[PDB]
Design a protein around this ligand. Sequence first.
Ligand SMILES: [Zn+2]
Length: 49
Amino acid sequence: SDLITCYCRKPFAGRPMIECSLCGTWIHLSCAKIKKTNVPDFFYCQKCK
Ligand SMILES: [Zn+2]
């Protein structure tokens, strides 16, 4: 049984996800507009910034 934590109402489903460095919620990297080639050391979601 999978989890939904990202703001697009869609579950993990094997998709890479990054943690909100502040609120802790897990955001799909695609939704966070993050390329696998450049990944922030600290990430902040829309709610927390
Ligand atoms: Zn997502």
